[PDB]
Amino acid sequence: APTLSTDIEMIATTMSVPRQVEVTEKFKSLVTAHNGKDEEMKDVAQDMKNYMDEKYGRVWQCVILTGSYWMHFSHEPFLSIQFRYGRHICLAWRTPR
Amino acid sequence: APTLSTDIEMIATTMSVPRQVEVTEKFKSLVTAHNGKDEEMKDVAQDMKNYMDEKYGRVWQCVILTGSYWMHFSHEPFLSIQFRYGRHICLAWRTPR
Numbered sequence: 001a002p003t004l005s006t007d008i009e010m011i012a013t014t015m016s017v018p019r020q021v022e023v024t025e026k027f028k029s030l031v032t033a034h035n036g037k038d039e040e041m042k043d044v045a046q047d048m049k050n051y052m053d054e055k056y057g058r059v060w061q062c063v064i065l066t067g068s069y070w071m072h073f074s075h076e077p078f079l080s081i082q083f084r085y086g087r088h089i090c091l092a093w094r095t096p097r
Numbered sequence: 098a099p100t101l102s103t104d105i106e107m108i109a110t111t112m113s114v115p116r117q118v119e120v121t122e123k124f125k126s127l128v129t130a131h132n133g134k135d136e137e138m139k140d141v142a143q144d145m146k147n148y149m150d151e152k153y154g155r156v157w158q159c160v161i162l163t164g165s166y167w168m169h170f171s172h173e174p175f176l177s178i179q180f181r182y183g184r185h186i187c188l189a190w191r192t193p194r
């Protein structure tokens with residue numbers, strides 16, 4: 001404890017459990033504040049990106065999605081997190097500057 | 098001409114039509130070479146990323162997805178392209194280094 005909540009499925013991350021908990025709990029609070037509406041998920045992606053820049057340094061990208069996904073950023077190591085909360089998959093990783 | 102093919106839906110891009118055509122035609126050839134299988138879309142994302150680094154400079158990220166999506170990278174301008182071919186949405190944008 002603090003422990004990863006039971007309604008998050010961690011898919012892949014190079015971040016520690018304390019960071020996983022802050023990131024996922026923040027995402028859940030944002031989605032809840034926006035009543036889970038897809039129509040407002042852009043605000044959520046933006047507020048997640050700003051939260052992460054502030055807290056863990058720039059530059060973050062945030063992708064929220066439904067369905068499946070396949071990605072490539074870099075074979076070299078970089079700060080990253082991928083998880084599922086309900087219907088929404090959340091991707092976030094940090095790039096230079 | 099070269100013109101954007103009728104089976105691509107451009108969703109948003111800051112790249113010119115010549116670049117749009119090369120990127121989308123390359124994506125279509127890769128998906129066709131992999132028989133459209135979701136199970137191999139990781140190879141496609143990787144080969145798209147390498148094609149784009151080579152052709153337009155580093156560093157590219159590539160996300161292929163089904164379903165909906167909402168993202169944020171940067172309010173500042175950066176090289177980007179988003180489009181749909183059949184069931185697959187393809188996102189790609191360039192970050193520093």
Ligand SMILES: [Cl-]
Pocket residue numbers: 048049052060061062063091092093
């Ligand atoms: Cl993020």
Ligand SMILES: [Cl-]
Pocket residue numbers: 071072073074075
């Ligand atoms: Cl990868």
Ligand SMILES: [Cl-]
Pocket residue numbers: 145146149157158159160188189190
């Ligand atoms: Cl790409």
Ligand SMILES: [Cl-]
Pocket residue numbers: 168169170171172
């Ligand atoms: Cl945005």
Ligand SMILES: [Hg+2]
Pocket residue numbers: 045048049061062063064090091092
């Ligand atoms: Hg995110």
Ligand SMILES: [Hg+2]
Pocket residue numbers: 142145146158159160161187188189
């Ligand atoms: Hg792509």
